[PDB]
Amino acid sequence: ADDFAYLNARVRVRRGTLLKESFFQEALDLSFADFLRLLSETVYGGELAGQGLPDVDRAVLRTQAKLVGDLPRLVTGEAREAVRLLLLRNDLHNLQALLRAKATGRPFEEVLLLPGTLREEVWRQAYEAQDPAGMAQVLAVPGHPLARALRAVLRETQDLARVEALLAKRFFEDVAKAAKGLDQPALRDYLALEVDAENLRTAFKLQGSGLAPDAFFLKGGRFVDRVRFARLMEGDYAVLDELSGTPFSGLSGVRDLKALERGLRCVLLKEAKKGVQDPLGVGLVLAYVKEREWEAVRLRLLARRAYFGLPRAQVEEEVVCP
Amino acid sequence: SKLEAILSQEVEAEIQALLQ
Amino acid sequence: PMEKLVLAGPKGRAKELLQSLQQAGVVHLETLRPEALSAYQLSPEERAELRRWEAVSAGAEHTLSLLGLEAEPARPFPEGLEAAEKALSPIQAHAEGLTRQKQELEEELALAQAYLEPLERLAALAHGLDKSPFLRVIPFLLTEKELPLVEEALRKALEDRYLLAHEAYAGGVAALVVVHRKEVDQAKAALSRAGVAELRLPGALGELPLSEAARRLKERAEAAPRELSEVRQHLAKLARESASTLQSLWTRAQDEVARLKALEELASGRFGFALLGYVPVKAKPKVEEALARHKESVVYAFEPVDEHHEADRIPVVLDNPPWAKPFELLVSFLNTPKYGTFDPTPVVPVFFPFWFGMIVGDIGYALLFYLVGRWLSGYVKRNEPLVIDLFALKLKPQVIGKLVHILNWMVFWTVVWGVIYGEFFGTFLEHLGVFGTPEHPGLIPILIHRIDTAKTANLLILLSVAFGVVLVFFGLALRAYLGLKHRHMAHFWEGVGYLGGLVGVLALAASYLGNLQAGWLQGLMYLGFGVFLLAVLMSRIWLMIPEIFTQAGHILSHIRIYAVGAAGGILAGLLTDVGFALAERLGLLGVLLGLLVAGVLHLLILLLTTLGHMLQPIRLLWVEFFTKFGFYEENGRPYRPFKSVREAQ
Amino acid sequence: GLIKSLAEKEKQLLERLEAAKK
Amino acid sequence: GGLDRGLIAVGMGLAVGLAALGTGVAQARIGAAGVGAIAEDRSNFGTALIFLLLPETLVIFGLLIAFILNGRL
Amino acid sequence: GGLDRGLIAVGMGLAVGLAALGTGVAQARIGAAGVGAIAEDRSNFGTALIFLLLPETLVIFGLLIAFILNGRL
Amino acid sequence: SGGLDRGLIAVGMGLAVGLAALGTGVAQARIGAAGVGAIAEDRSNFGTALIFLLLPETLVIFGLLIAFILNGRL
Amino acid sequence: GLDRGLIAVGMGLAVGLAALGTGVAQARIGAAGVGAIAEDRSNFGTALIFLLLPETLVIFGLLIAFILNGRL
Amino acid sequence: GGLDRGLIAVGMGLAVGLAALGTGVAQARIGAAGVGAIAEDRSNFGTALIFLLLPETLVIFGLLIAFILNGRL
Amino acid sequence: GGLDRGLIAVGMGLAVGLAALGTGVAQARIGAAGVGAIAEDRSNFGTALIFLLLPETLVIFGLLIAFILNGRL
Amino acid sequence: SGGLDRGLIAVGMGLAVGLAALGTGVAQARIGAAGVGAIAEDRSNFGTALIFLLLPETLVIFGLLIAFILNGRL
Amino acid sequence: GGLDRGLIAVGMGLAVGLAALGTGVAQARIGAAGVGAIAEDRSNFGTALIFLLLPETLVIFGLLIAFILNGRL
Amino acid sequence: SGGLDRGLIAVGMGLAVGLAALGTGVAQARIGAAGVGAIAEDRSNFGTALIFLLLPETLVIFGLLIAFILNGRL
Amino acid sequence: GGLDRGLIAVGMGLAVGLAALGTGVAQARIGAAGVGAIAEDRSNFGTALIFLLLPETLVIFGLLIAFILNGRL
Amino acid sequence: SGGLDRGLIAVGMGLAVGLAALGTGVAQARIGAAGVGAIAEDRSNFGTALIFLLLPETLVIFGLLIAFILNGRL
Amino acid sequence: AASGGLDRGLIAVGMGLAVGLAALGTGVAQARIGAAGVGAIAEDRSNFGTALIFLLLPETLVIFGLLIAFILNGRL
């Protein structure tokens, strides 16, 4: 424990059973019965306990609770402090997605959960509550850091676009506070890139709604700045049509938050995949967590394509990151 | 203290039911 | 050697028999099959059959894994695809149902045991005030950093006729507002303005009094582990009721999909069904029997295969003689040779057991190893798999016969070196004067007194280096030869270049660790370094200038047959001699203690050291020899015959 | 609190006397 | 005799001890990685053992020199 | 007769001192992995302990040289 | 030299216990930090964490063995 | 003479290296213990047990130093 | 005849300086953990200070031997 | 004959130098935490100085023995 | 006076400055690395970064004091 | 006299000892990476042996200098 | 032999400069990697990054002071 | 006097030993990065060896000096 | 004696250059790893990365200066 | 012993110090610089030149120690 020579041997065993790209090529034209078949030959076939869309979804959820959600418990000390930050970011995604879904009135099955620290039945229990302050109470029984943060946000404001923006500020303040001493080169580089992408998402969430750039901007990034953020929040999309040298150069002609989130998660995956060059540090576990997280998003899409029998051509853009 | 001072408010709202 | 292979390829003038040809062509199994020109044969009805058979295969191994089993082969399922699907479907549905029960019992228990502590804290912070007819209670969780914001929110919203009891626990606070019945809506608004709400208890238990809700989490958390034990017993019983059926059905489905997948690799046209495949020359008599029944339609012949072109394409399988076959275990996991390259397997039985005998060199240790060989032989003889779950070790009884053959060769060299060193538990027969030398002469003269360091070290250091010279030079001769066998001059120059450089390095060392002379050394040295500098300029492999120091170190690396042997020898001696200290200082109790303590220490250091003694010999082959002739530079195609999964029983 | 739960515990005796008086 | 025998013994303690420190430095990271591979899949035991035992040839080259020096005492 | 009786004892100090140090460097990372592996699944006790005890070979080799030197003293 | 003879034996004793105590402390550093971290998940890990903390003490006992053999010559 | 002189160097090595080795053990153990108490105040007793058990290395260094002090 | 006072003074410098070095290798980490705790909750001050000052018994043991040796000097 | 005064001066170099090293390794990690804390919230300055300055009690014990030895030159 | 006395004073004097200058070099690798990262986060951190970097420079002044006390004995 | 025979032996202890210590420093990290490669895919084994046993020319060249010295003794 | 002083005075110079040179090397290693990384994020950070790099270079100047004081005595 | 061959052999063992140690420290990190590169893409094997062999100059320069000193024994 | 001067001055030179060369090397390790990474992110910072790699090479030049001052005595 | 044997003796110890600690110095430098270079080349082969330039600059340390060893050998 507190040794990446030990943790990365456990991660290497698990990388051996990450899905091959031929799966996503062969699975694409199947019936739902033939998709269930092909999936039951993989690592996810241990958690298949039925033959409907709820059983595929539960198999993907429960497989990743075992294969990703345990990574902070395997280690102790400074290695736990690096590896836990990777999963607390997914808990922030999950919390923000549920706050938005509950305000829209959507079904809990029709919102995406990424492999953070909590289990499905706790997010399910929190979503069954009546209000954001009720979600904050269900996250308090686990003792989770975002419970304490969300109660402070809900003392400042009730308007949900601002609740999302203020949760992101409290998380990345707590991330910087936790990470800055850990002596990992791959982690500090990835945290800057993660904050830059969250500034872009913040300006799109607050697009044209009236603006206060210095109040909403997040510090600790590199590639995005107050001048580009302010113009983005005025609706001047030229700001990210203008980029050529930074990793985000390639968001040119993005005009909705679905096309943004599809671009951001590919460049943040690409930059994490370089961590395979760090065999005895945080880079290898960072790579694996992003590879396995992207594999679950592709499986989520395929299962619905095969179930509803949808035309293939449009989904092929949504399901690659080449 | 306030644990006795509530006896003139919410305590009195229960104690008033005996005369109804 | 790797086995000599040739191309089979039956053809004919009628299409329809090709499924019968594939059937006999899997009953005898000899052929690895490429695509005969390219893959372009299938039908939509054959796709529907392949979908149904690959569904039976996947559904059977899936439900075997839900049952905690593994998909090993068995007797094939007797008849019918319709009966295959009708047999599988009720079993898979029961297995998935028991796993679905198990998953939800896990999820209920997990959520209950999380909420149970704060519910017990709040039920102890309450005194039955929840059950009051006249007033009401609001439960919530908080932190001491922000409790004053809740007190202020209540102070502003209600006229100080509320109460707020609390208790701290790890990372937080259990909190309990109390108010008159009219004012609960005002308390809920006050808490909301503080960023707080009522704690939602997980199930429909949210409607119950708090002291009545806490009891249910406690009893469910106590009861659910017994229900987990019941569903685990039922799922184990379902395995006993259905394993043999599933094993048989998975075996059938594997063979059916093997035929239907292999069907795509035929070429097709106006008459023909043309097949292609590489076959071992010793296997041809079975292919002849498989095709002789079909001479009513097939025509076939075996074409010779070129070793130059397609060498990356021809399959590799090994064919060593019966004394060398068991030693394939020591090499076949490292790489598969390319076709026309060398197979190093027959070099393993001649050097590995001999170096193990040189290292251990103790007759008493060789007898302990012989008793392990007798023990393993009992599993071969009874046909029992050995299992040791501590190691995840399982050996099938046919693999134990491979280990026992290797161990008998290791015992033989260990006894004959043990008489050369005069060693039996180190010094035991040499204290007794059975073995001796001129300091205290005995019945049997010791041929090389291994521990007489000032008399024997130069002999055993030179003898160890002489094996290093012999195999390093032989591996470089194989590289020069295998270069010429393919006209590949970049391998020829590297082989003869390193050989000349090593003769130069040795002739230099011999001329300095002694005296110089013109004819025998000082000439041959300049020929050696001359052939090296030539081979570098001819090949333009500039890595030779670094790597000649690697090659010269691989000769010196063989001094580990002396070093680990002599470390094993002195340590075994002093443990025996500690036994004779106890036996000479004291009476009959000392003869008992001396034997006992020496035996306990010998067994311990035979456990700690022996895997090291087995490993140091083999890795001299695996790197100091196998890296010389290029064993790792390319991988051959593995031989994968078109066969039934039933393994011929 | 750690003493405030005992002050509310004494205050619950007004519901016990209200129940005992019928 | 005298100091000569003393210094020959210092050369032995320096040969074995400082080569024993080399085998120990190697087995630390290898055996933590081995215990972790075996923990995630119990079939990794044989590969983890081979790599753990390979560094044991460094404490033995230190012993070789220590025994060649003890031949003088 | 004295300059050896002195220095042979410092050859013994180096031999067990640096071999106890080399064993401690090995056990540090291996036993820290072993505790975490057993805490995750208690069936790891055998595969944790075997990897912990194989490094004790180094201090046995340090004791071997020290008990040889003790007779030459 | 009888003075240096007595003197150098005490230097050999100081190195024997000192370097084995240093080797034991190097082992206990990483093992005991994992032990504390495991007991902070689950109080039932105490017995195995204490076994692995105390097992490394064999190193300093082998140092004390040689130091007491040497002390017998003073 | 060089017996008093060089025995005092053996006393310095015995306490000094064993105090060094205790400090190495306590460095990581006490950083774990402070973090454990900061998460749950009930972890204090086991934190002091694990922090003080390494002091058994200084007692072994001091024992040999007091045995050597008997040769002066 | 001053050579024994000469080595007694080296015994004092080794005792205190090498024991002063171990208590700093302890508080490096114990004090970094203390400043990190006190930043996130100021009630951690007393417990962090007990732990940062407990490793200071290794430097009072160094001085004990250095003053015993000054009694000879 | 001055092998007292020479080796007393070597004892003084080990007393201050090896204790100055010991407090330097303590301050390295403690001060890296303190510069972090005071940049998160400047009200941490007083406790960040206390934790940085307390390890300076390991070079005062080095100087104590160095000055005691200097009284004998 | 006398070669070994006058010479060993220069050895003790070299250890006093060398180990103390080594010691203050070990503190500011980490304290100075934290300081330049804190100034990259905001310029107002410059004063506290220099104060924390320069305190550690109180170790080499103690090594120089003992080396100058020894240099007076030559 | 035997002052050189003794010092030649302490030169041999340095030669094999420091060379044995530097190859362990290499294989610790090359071996801990190597077992991880074989854990993801068994077909890596031959390359992971080649790299782990490549740093072992440093102990064959230190042991050679000890044998040249053993010819002068 | 009693004539030994210049030999030990030269060893004192080597320890004084070479071990204080080691001290500034440990300091500049971590400060300079943080400085190079800060200048790669923002080219304006060069002034503070270079001042912090060049400030740890006063541990090697105190080593030279003691070595040149000792050079006057040989 | 008669110690000259002794101190020459001490200087030789120290030259090869510290130079073997220096290249072992280089190969530890450079060789783990090569096992990292080759497990991602097996075309990296050649460039992984070029970087891994470039540290081998350090032992060659230390060993060159040992053979120059051996001519004085 | 003149032979102890000659012999023992020459070990003081080995310490002065060797221990200072070790000081430059421990600086260049972390600075040059950051430099290669920064040049891979953007080739424009090669001049900064080379200036920071060469500045640590003033440590070995100071040890080399004391070694040439000593060689003038030898 | 005779001082005109000890000068030959300790000049050879000084040479082992000069080259040994200087070779150790470039060994510490190349360890991190070359692991950074291998990663940069495995990402993009256009990094090969800049990686090799940075790797070979530290070699000046062993050459400086080796210079002092050849100055000492001239006195032996």
CB–CB contact E33 L29 (8 Å): no
Q: Are L24 and E23 in contact (CB under 8 A)?
A: yes
**Could you give the CA distance from residue I57 to residue I53 in angstroms, rounded to a whole number?**
8
Would you say F21 and G22 are in contact if contact means Cβ atoms under 8 Å apart? yes
Chain C contacts of D13, Cβ < 8 Å?
none
What's the token pair of residue C102? Answer: 């198990």
Tokens of C60: 């059977």
Residue C358, C-beta contacts closer than 8 angstroms, at least 6 positions apart: C413, C417, C561, C565
Q: Are A186 and A156 in contact (CB under 8 A)?
A: no
In angstroms, the Cα distances linking C127 to C115, C123, D7 are 20, 7, 11
Nearest to C575 by CA among C420, C425, C358: C425
E46 burial via Cβ count (<10 Å: 0-12, 13-18, 19+): exposed
Q: Name every residue in A having a CB less than 8 A away from some CB of J.
A: 177, 180-181
What's the alpha-carbon Rg for chain P, to the nearest Å? Answer: 18
Total domains present in chain A: 3
- How many degrees, rounded to 5, is the angle at CA F63 between CA F62 and CA F65? 70
- Across the interface, whether the CB atoms of A77 and G38 are under 8 A apart is answered no
Rounded-to-integer distance, Cα I3 and Cα H4, Å: 10
Structure tokens at C226: 């017994």
Q: Which two tokens stand for residue O37?
A: 């990474």
Query: What gap in Å lies between CA A94 and CA A117, rounded to an integer?
Result: 10
Task: Nearest chain A residue to P42 by CA: give it.
Answer: A277
Strand, coil or helix: O63: helix
Residue type for position A106: R
Are chains A and L in contact at 3+ CB pairs closer than 8 Å? yes
Distance CA A31, CA C242 (A): 28
Neighbours of A320 (CB within 10 A): 11
**Whole-number Å distance between alpha carbons of C348 and C321:** 13
Report the C-alpha gap between A219 and A212 in whole angstroms.
15
* K and J interact (at least 3 Cβ pairs within 8 A): yes
User: Phi/psi at C444 (nearest 5 deg)?
Assistant: -120, 120
> How many whole angstroms separate alpha carbon B14 and alpha carbon B10?
7
Say whether both A177 and A187 belong to one domain.
no
Contacts (Cβ under 8 Å, ≥6 apart) of C314: C5, C278, C305, C307, C339, C636, C637
Query: What single DSSP character describes residue C309?
Result: T
Chain A to chain H, count of Cβ pairs less than 8 Å apart?
4
CB pairs under 8 A between J and K: 147
For residue C632, which residues of chain L lie inside 8 Å, CB to CB?
46-47, 50
Q: Cα(F9)–Cα(F65) distance, rounded to whole angstroms?
A: 12
Helices A77-104 and A4-15, interaxial angle, to 10°? 50
Token match 């198990």: residue? C102
- Tell me which amino acid residue C454 is: A
Residues A10 and A95 occupy one common structural domain: no
Gap between the Cα atoms of M73 and M65, Å rounded: 13
Minimal C-alpha gap between K60 and chain A (Å): 26
Find the CB nearest O38 among M12, M37, M67.
Answer: M37
Q: Which amino acid is at C228?
A: L
CA-CA distance, C236 to D21, in Å (whole number)?
61
Q: Which helix (H) or strand (E) holds A196?
A: helix A185-205
For residue P28, which of L29, N58, M33, L14 has the smallest C-alpha distance? N58
Which 8-state DSSP code applies to residue C316? E
Polymer length in residues for chain J: 73
Tokens of C431: 């204290």
- Other residues' Cβ atoms within 10 Å of the Cβ of residue A29: 11
Distance from CA of D12 to the nearest CA of C (A): 6
Within 8 A by CB and 6+ apart from A319, the residues are A24, A298, A301, A302
The two three-digit tokens of residue B12, written as one number: 């009195």
Whichever domain contains A137, its CATH number is 1.20.1690.10
Interface test with M, best of O13, O17, O30 (most M CBs within 10 A): O30
Do C346 and C324 contact (CB within 8 A), yes or no? yes
Three-state DSSP state, O20: helix
Write down the residue that tokens 């998660």 correspond to.
A265
Neighbors of chain F with 3 or more C-beta pairs under 8 Å: A, C, E, G
- CA–chain centroid gap for G74, Å, is 23
Which residues are C638's β-sheet partners? Answer: C316
Asked if the Cβ–Cβ distance from P43 to A277 is below 8 Å, we say: yes
Touching pair E, C by Cβ (3+ pairs < 8 Å) = yes
CA distance, residue L35 to nearest chain N CA (Å): 10
Please indicate, yes or no, whether residues A21 and A49 belong to a single structural domain of this protein. Answer: yes
Tokens at L72, concatenated: 């002068």
Which backbone phi and psi does C136 adopt, to 5 degrees? -150, 160
Report yes or no: C134 at the D interface, CB cutoff 8 Å. Answer: yes
Give me C69's structure tokens: 């089993």
Which chain A positions have a beta carbon within 8 Å of C191's beta carbon? Answer: 133
- Surface of O (39-68) touching M: CB under 8 A: 41-42, 45, 48-49, 52, 55-56, 58-60, 62-63, 66
Q: From CA F43, how far away is CA L32, in angstroms rounded?
A: 24
Check if the beta carbon of residue H32 is closer than 8 Å to that of residue H46.
no
Of the residues A150, A182, A214, the one at which a domain ends: A182
Neighbours of C226 (CB within 10 A): 8
DSSP H helices in M1-45: 5-41
E39 touches chain C (CB under 8 A): no
Does A204 share its domain with A275? yes
Shortest Cα distance from C629 to chain N (angstroms)? 17
Q: Are O65 and M21 in contact (CB under 8 A)?
A: no
K41/A219 Cβ within 8 A: yes
Task: Specify the 3-state DSSP secondary structure of C5.
Answer: strand
Query: CA-based angle E42:E48:E49, to the nearest 5?
Result: 110
Q: N- to C-terminal Cα distance for chain D?
A: 32
| Cβ neighbours of C28 (radius 10 Å) | 18
The beta-carbon neighbor of C567 closest among E42, E50, E60 is: E60
Question: Given a contact as 3+ CB pairs under 8 Å, which chains touch N?
Answer: A, C, L, P
The answer to whether J5 faces chain I, any CB pair under 8 Å, is yes
* In a shared domain, residues A111 and A99: yes
**CA O12/CA O70 separation, integer angstroms:** 8
Kindly tell me whether chain P and chain I come into contact, counting contact as 3+ Cβ pairs under 8 Å: no
| Residue reference for tokens 């078109």 | C642
Mutation site for E-interface testing, chosen from C394, C399, C403, C453 by largest number of E Cβ within 10 Å: C453
Q: Tell the residue number behind the tokens 């300086």, with chain if given.
A: I17
| C residues 135..164 contacting A (CB < 8 A) | 140-143, 145-146, 149
Chains within contact range of chain E (3+ C-beta pairs < 8 Å): A, C, F, L
Beta bridge partners of C435: C444
Work out the minimum CA distance from K1 to partner chain J, whole angstroms: 8
- A91, A166: one domain: yes
Q: How far apart are CA C641 and CA C645, in angstroms?
A: 11
Angle at alpha carbon of residue G64, lines to G61 and G70, rounded to 5° = 150
Q: Which of K14, K21, K37 sits opposite M23 (nearest CB)?
A: K21
- To the nearest whole Å, the CA of F44 is away from the closest chain C CA by 9
Tell me the C-alpha to C-alpha distance, in Å, between residue A103 and each of A202, A203, C192.
18, 20, 17
Q: DSSP per residue over C427-486, as a string?
A: BHHHHTTSEE-TTS--SEE-SS-TT-HHHHHHHHHHHHHHHHHHHHHHHHHHHHHHHHTT
Q: 3-state DSSP: chain K helix, strand, coil percent, rounded to 5?
A: 90, 0, 10
Cα atoms in the 13 Å half-sphere on the side-chain side of C284: 14
Q: Where are the alpha helices (DSSP H) in chain N?
A: 4-40, 45-53, 57-70
In the numeric block, which tokens belong to residue L35?
């077992």
| Distance between CA atoms of residues M60 and M16, nearest Å | 9
E36 neighbors A1 (Cβ within 8 angstroms)? no
Q: To 10 degrees, the CA torsion angle through K4, K10, K11, K16?
A: 150
Residue C133 φ/ψ, nearest 5 degrees: -70, -20
H or E stretch covering C166:
strand C163-169
- G73 interfacial to chain F (CB closer than 8 Å): yes
CA distances from A142 to A68, C116, C194, C317, H37 (A): 18, 11, 21, 58, 18
What pairs with residue C637 in β-bridges?
A: C315
What burial class does residue C101 get, using C-beta atoms within 10 Å of its C-beta: 0-12 exposed, 13-18 middle, 19+ buried? Answer: middle
The last residue of a domain, from among A182, A198, A227: A182
Same domain assignment for residues A114 and A137:
yes
If you search the block for the tokens 């208790």, which residue do you land on?
Answer: C167
Question: How many whole angstroms separate alpha carbon A45 and alpha carbon L24?
Answer: 43
Same-domain pairing of A137 and A225: no
Among candidates E42, E63, E71 on the partner chain, residue whose Cβ is nearest the Cβ of C392: E42
Do A62 and A84 fall within a single domain? no
C299: buried, middle or exposed (CB in 10 Å: 19+, 13-18, 0-12)?
exposed
Q: Are β-strands C163-169 and C277-280 bridged in parallel, bridged antiparallel, or unpaired?
A: unpaired
- Subunits close to P (at least 3 CB pairs below 8 A): A, N, O
Claim to verify: residue A7 and residue A40 sit in the same structural domain: yes
Helices (H), chain P: 3-43, 48-56, 60-73
Beta-carbon contacts of residue A111 (< 8 Å; ≥ 6 apart): A97, A98, A101
Among candidate residues A152, A126, A124, A145, the one with its CA nearest the CA of residue A137: A126
Phi first, then psi, for residue C299 (nearest 5°) are -125, 135
3-state secondary structure of C632: coil
Q: Which two tokens stand for residue N54?
A: 């470039």
Answer for the pair N66, N16: CB distance below 8 angstroms, yes or no.
Answer: yes
Phi first, then psi, for residue C200 (nearest 5°) are -75, 105
Instruction: Write the DSSP string, C495-517.
Output: HHHHHHHHHHHHHHHHHHSS---
| N21 inside 8 A of chain C by CB | no
- Please list every residue in chain C whose beta carbon sits closer than 8 Å to the beta carbon of residue L30: none
Rg (C-alpha) for chain B, rounded Å, is: 9
**Neighbour count for residue C547 (Cβ, 10 Å):** 17
Mutation test of the interface with chain I: which of H7, H20, H52, H59, choosing the one with the most I Cβ atoms within 10 A?
H20
Overall resolution, Å: 2.8
Question: What is the 8-class DSSP label of residue E43?
Answer: G
Provide φ and ψ at C627, rounded to 5°.
-75, -10
Tell how far CA N8 is from the center of its chain: 20
Q: How far apart are CA C452 and CA C440, in angstroms?
A: 14
Under 8 Å between Cβ of A84 and F44: no
Torsion of CA K46, K48, K54, K58, to 10 degrees: 170
Could you tell me where the DSSP H helices lie in chain E? 3-40, 45-53, 58-70
> Which of F10, F35, F59 minimises the CB distance to G35?
F35
Rounded alpha-carbon distances, angstroms, from residue C585 to C425, C582, G69: 21, 5, 19
Chain F CB contacts of G16 under 8 Å are 12-13, 16-17
Closest CA to C494 of C530, C461, C444, C535: C535
> How many distinct helices (H) and strands (E) make up chain G?
3, 0
Tokens of E53: 């035992």
Pairing relationship of beta strands C315-316 and C637-638 according to DSSP bridges: parallel
Beta bridge partners of C299: C11
Give me H8's structure tokens.
């005092």
> Are A34 and A49 within one domain?
yes
| Contact present, C509 and N67 (Cβ < 8 Å) | no
- Taking an 8 Å cut-off on Cβ atoms, the answer to whether O45 and M39 are in contact is yes
**Identity at A85, one-letter amino acid code:** L
Q: Cβ F40–A73 below 8 Å, yes or no?
A: yes
Residue type, E72: R
Instruction: Say how far apart CA L45 and CA C335 lie, in whole Å.
Output: 9
Q: Do K36 and M31 touch (CB under 8 A)?
A: yes
- Closest chain B residue by Cα to residue D17: B15
Measured CA to CA in angstroms, residue C525 lies from A98, C470, C538, C634, N71 at distances of: 80, 18, 20, 34, 21
Query: d(Cα C647, Cα N55) in Å, to the nearest integer?
Result: 52
In order, the DSSP letters of C72-123 are: ---SPP-S-HHHHHHHHHHHHHHHHHHHHHHHHHHHHHHHHHHHHHHHHHHH
Which among L32, L33, L40 has the least Cβ separation from residue A15?
Answer: L40
Contact of chains E and L by CB distance (3 or more pairs under 8 angstroms):
yes
CA–centroid distance for G20 within its chain: 5
DSSP state of C11: E
Residues 6+ apart with CB under 8 A from C330: C348, C352, C406, C618, C621
- What Å distances lie between residue O56 and C547, N32, O27, CA to CA? 33, 26, 6
What is the torsion angle, in degrees rounded to the nearest 10, for the CA atoms of residue G13, residue G18, residue G21 and residue G23?
Answer: -110
Range(s) of the domain holding residue A149: 77-182
Q: What is the dihedral of CA C24, C30, C33, C37, to 10 degrees?
A: -80
Residue in this structure with the two tokens 């066969």, named with its chain if needed: C643
Dist. CA F48–CA H70, nearest whole Å: 44
Q: Check if the beta carbon of residue I12 is closer than 8 Å to that of residue J57.
A: no
Residues 326-345 in C contacting E (C-alpha not used; CB under 8 Å): none
Q: Specify the long-range contacts of residues A245-254, CB closer than 8 Å, at least 24 apart.
A: A245/O42, A247/A193, A247/A223, A247/A271, A248/A196, A248/A197, A248/A200, A248/A223, A248/A224, A251/A200
Residue that the structure tokens 């609960």 belong to: C184
Decide if C133 and B10 are in contact by the 8 Å CB cutoff: no
- A241 and A315, same domain (yes or no): no
Interface touch F36/A1, C-beta < 8 Å: yes
Strands C435-436 and C386-388, bridge-based pairing: unpaired
Question: Which of A317, H22, A285, A67 has the alpha carbon at shortest distance from I24?
Answer: H22
Alpha helices in A28-159, H assignment, sequence order: 32-40, 53-67, 71-74, 77-104, 120-127, 132-138, 145-156
Looking up tokens 């510490």 gives P28
Q: Do residues M17 and K22 make contact, with C-beta atoms less than 8 angstroms apart?
A: no
Answer whether A142's CB lies under 8 Å from A160's CB. Answer: no
C33, G56, H61, O22 from I19: Cα distances, Å = 74, 22, 11, 26
Whether residue A181 and residue J32 make contact (CB cut-off 8 A), yes or no, is yes
Residue C11 has which token pair? 């053809």
Task: Please list the residues that pair with C141 across neighbouring strands.
Answer: C174
Pairing of strands C277-280, C5-8: antiparallel
- The CATH number that applies at residue A285 is 1.10.132.50
